[PDB]
Amino acid sequence: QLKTKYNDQVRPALMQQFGYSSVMAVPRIEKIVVNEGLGSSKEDSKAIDKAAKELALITLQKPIITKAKKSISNFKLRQGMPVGIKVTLRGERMYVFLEKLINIGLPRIRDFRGINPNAFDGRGNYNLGIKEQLIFPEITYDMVDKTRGMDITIVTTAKTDEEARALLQSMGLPFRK
Amino acid sequence: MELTAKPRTPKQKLDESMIAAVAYNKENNVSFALDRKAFDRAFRQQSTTGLFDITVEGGETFPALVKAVQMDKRKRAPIHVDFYMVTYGEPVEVSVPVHTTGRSQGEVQGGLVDIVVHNLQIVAPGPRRIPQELVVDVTKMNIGDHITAGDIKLPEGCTLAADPELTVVSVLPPR
Amino acid sequence: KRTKFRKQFRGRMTGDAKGGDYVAFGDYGLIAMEPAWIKSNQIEACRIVMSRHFRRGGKIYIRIFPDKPVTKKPAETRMGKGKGAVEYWVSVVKPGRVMFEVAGVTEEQAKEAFRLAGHKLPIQTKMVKREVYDEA
Amino acid sequence: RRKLRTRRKVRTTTAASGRLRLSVYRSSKHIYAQIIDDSRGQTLAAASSAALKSGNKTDTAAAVGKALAAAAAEKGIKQVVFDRGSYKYHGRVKALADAAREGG
RNA sequence: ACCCCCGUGCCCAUAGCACUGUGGAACCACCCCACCCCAUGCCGAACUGGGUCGUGAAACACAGCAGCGCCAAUGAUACUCGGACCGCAGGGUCCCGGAAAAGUCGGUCAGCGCGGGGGU
Ligand SMILES: [Mg+2]
Ligand SMILES: [Mg+2]
Ligand SMILES: [Mg+2]
Ligand SMILES: [Mg+2]
Ligand SMILES: [Mg+2]
Ligand SMILES: [Mg+2]
Ligand SMILES: [Mg+2]
Ligand SMILES: [Mg+2]
Ligand SMILES: [Mg+2]
Ligand SMILES: [Mg+2]
Ligand SMILES: [Mg+2]
Ligand SMILES: [Mg+2]
Ligand SMILES: [Mg+2]
Ligand SMILES: [Mg+2]
Ligand SMILES: [Mg+2]
């Protein structure tokens, strides 16, 4: 399937590009992650279903309401209030989302020149940060009430930034040369 | 040098003001006691880098480095000493005085040199070839410069036991 | 001088000091011989004297510090409510404790500076150059 | 995964007074079982399934319980503890139980 | 009898961490699949249910090693039961037993059972 074309397109391609004794030693993808974070300044109980609906429709999975850590502060910080929207994608659905990005999230972009190339972790396996929601295959501005922005971390069992770099490059991620 | 007794009882030691002592290593850590004034002339002549021979009234000389003295807080006099018997592999982590050479050009325009670390503990000095001092030329230094351990030159077979980046001597401004 | 800190008031007794019998910083050091409190302005007068004699030059360290609050009941009352809220901060000082130590000044001028500073301290005190030293 | 092991292991050896231990190991296809006399540093009646084979793990393990029930039966085994490792009393180890003491 | 593995205890830092090396078709481990038993306040990641292969990659097991932790003497001192003193006072001394903390010398990367599996 769309994965095994990914692994054998890369798994030999990295075992060929780089020596690893084991097919298990090739970097993989542990999980896609989306932090939504909706209403992190907008205290919208009406919009809690907003981001919940947009995420559950565009992501083929139910989202959880990452509640405020309870570090109440000078500003509008408090314990038990909802503050963000987490969704973890594993396996089949994570591959479907990575394909929706690689085949419609790069066409979706405005003014593309790549994505930022300096790997985020020192351990690798890192996180795209959406700056706008207008151009996703599921996020229509007409059906949507208003524009918003989400987050999409992705984990990889790469041991270094260079290795997940080569893996995410061969897999179909654009790069900012 | 010379020393005689080493009873567990100390009442004899205080009267003739002779310092208490010990000598130890891996094999034998036997305690002893020796004369005071000759010990102080010797400890003046050599510090923690200097060494001397002890001739316990048993007929065999031994070669000792000085390792620690612990003495009276009120009276300034030294109380107790710990000489260290040393095999001729490099003595462990010996301390070396810092000393400055030249008239620094930082001193000539209102500054003054300040030795931020009066002793530097280097590992593997090499016994019998120990550095009894450590000259550092400060003439290049201007006000606000730092001569770190990455500068201090070393003799044979020596490697600094302290972090090289650490500040050693520094010139300082007025006031 | 006064600390910016914690509980207002304390107690009091004595035993010979441990936390600084040896002169780490600098060349020479004046050193206490008696167990008095030292407190604030007594030190600060030592500081201002030595800074007059030496400054434009030299390095002055004050290894002692007014930690301990001391209290005065008001005016003239009977043993009444509680203790008295304020008055002055002190530093306990036991013999062999080092209060002072100069840098970058000739032996003789350090003599004269220690003499001036010690002519206004409750304790008598003795100066020394640093012998051989250990504790690192 | 760790804390549940020592958790049930502390609650087991608290409840252990008189009664013997019965520590089912399940992490592999090795659903070994032992009967340990806490106090004495000894086991007495293990029923490991390295030679046995009956198909699906839930039913293979079933026979292991049965094997064990005969072994302890030859030693005069009253009751026992149970000492689950971390495995949430599920059908394969729940079966090792129903098989152990249905045939005890 | 020798070897090693899987469990499991006594002892729970002299037995722990870091760097390093060695193990796979015995054993364990990752791994494959999952509609259902079962299950994730979303995700089979974890619990969970059916199993090769592949791979020891990671983990785990074992071995090296003293950079880090942890252990830690002797000499002496602090303090002190008891005995007898000094100072106006803060405070100090003497004889007699007890005796640290720290730090130096050094010591360690364990030691001891029960079972079951597989080797020779
Ligand atoms: Mg006292
Ligand atoms: Mg006393
Ligand atoms: Mg100290
Ligand atoms: Mg084991
Ligand atoms: Mg390793
Ligand atoms: Mg084999
Ligand atoms: Mg898996
Ligand atoms: Mg490995
Ligand atoms: Mg002793
Ligand atoms: Mg007595
Ligand atoms: Mg008494
Ligand atoms: Mg005594
Ligand atoms: Mg100790
Ligand atoms: Mg080891
Ligand atoms: Mg055995």
Swiss-Prot record, chain A:
Keyword Zinc: no
Keyword Ribonucleoprotein: yes
Alphabetized UniProt keyword annotations: Ribonucleoprotein, Ribosomal protein, RNA-binding, rRNA-binding, tRNA-binding
Pfam families named in the record: Ribosomal_L5, Ribosomal_L5_C
Listed Gene3D superfamilies: 3.30.1440.10
Molecular function GO terms recorded: RNA binding; rRNA binding; structural constituent of ribosome; tRNA binding
GO BP terms, alphabetized: translation
Record GO cellular component, one term: cytosolic large ribosomal subunit
Domain of life from the UniProt record: Bacteria
Record text on subunit structure and interactions: Forms a bridge to the 30S subunit in the 70S ribosome. Part of the 50S ribosomal subunit; part of the 5S rRNA/L5/L18/L25 (CTC) subcomplex. Is known to contact the 5S rRNA, 23S rRNA and the P site tRNA.
Protein name: Large ribosomal subunit protein uL5
Organism: Deinococcus radiodurans (strain ATCC 13939 / DSM 20539 / JCM 16871 / CCUG 27074 / LMG 4051 / NBRC 15346 / NCIMB 9279 / VKM B-1422 / R1)
Curated annotation (Swiss-Prot), chain B:
Chain spans, region N-terminal domain: 1-104
Region listing for Middle domain, in residue ranges: 105-175
Keywords for this protein: Ribonucleoprotein, Ribosomal protein, RNA-binding, rRNA-binding, tRNA-binding
GO CC term, one of those recorded: cytosolic large ribosomal subunit
A biological process term (GO) from this entry: translation
Molecular function as annotated in GO: 5S rRNA binding; structural constituent of ribosome; tRNA binding
Function according to Swiss-Prot or TrEMBL: This is one of 3 proteins that mediate the attachment of the 5S rRNA onto the large ribosomal subunit. This protein has three domains. The N-terminal one is bound on the solvent face, the middle domain fills the space between the 5S rRNA and the L11 arm contacting the 23S rRNA while the C-terminal domain is on the edge of the intersubunit interface and contacts the A site. The protein conformation changes upon binding of a tRNA mimic to the A site, although the mimic does not interact directly with CTC itself, consistent with CTCs presumed role in moderating A site binding.
Subunit and interaction comment: Part of the 50S ribosomal subunit. Contacts proteins L11 and L16, the A site tRNA, and the 5S and 23S rRNAs.
Family statement: Belongs to the bacterial ribosomal protein bL25 family. CTC subfamily.
Protein name listed in UniProt: Large ribosomal subunit protein bL25
Naturally occurring in which organism (per UniProt): Deinococcus radiodurans (strain ATCC 13939 / DSM 20539 / JCM 16871 / CCUG 27074 / LMG 4051 / NBRC 15346 / NCIMB 9279 / VKM B-1422 / R1)
UniProtKB/Swiss-Prot annotation, chain C:
GO cellular component, one term: cytosolic large ribosomal subunit
Record's keyword terms, sorted: Ribonucleoprotein, Ribosomal protein, RNA-binding, rRNA-binding, tRNA-binding
KW Metal-binding (keyword) present: no
Binding partners and assembly: Part of the 50S ribosomal subunit. Contacts the CTC protein (RL25).
Name of this protein: Large ribosomal subunit protein uL16
Endpoints of the signal sequence: none
GN (gene name): rplP
Gene Ontology BP, a term: translation
GO terms assigned for molecular function: rRNA binding; structural constituent of ribosome; tRNA binding
Short name of one Pfam family: Ribosomal_L16
HAMAP family: Ribosomal_uL16
UniProtKB/Swiss-Prot annotation, chain D:
GO MF annotation: an example: 5S rRNA binding
Key words, A-Z: Ribonucleoprotein, Ribosomal protein, RNA-binding, rRNA-binding
Domain of life: Bacteria
Gene Ontology CC: one annotated term: cytosolic large ribosomal subunit
Cited InterPro entries: Ribosomal_uL18_bac-type, Ribosomal_uL18_bac/euk
Gene Ontology BP annotations: translation
Gene3D superfamilies for this protein: 3.30.420.100
Function of the molecule: This is one of the proteins that bind and probably mediate the attachment of the 5S RNA into the large ribosomal subunit, where it forms part of the central protuberance.
Protein family: Belongs to the universal ribosomal protein uL18 family.
Oligomeric and partner information: Part of the 50S ribosomal subunit; part of the 5S rRNA/L5/L18/L25 subcomplex. Contacts the 23S rRNA. Contacts protein L27 and the 5S rRNA.
Name of the protein this chain belongs to: Large ribosomal subunit protein uL18
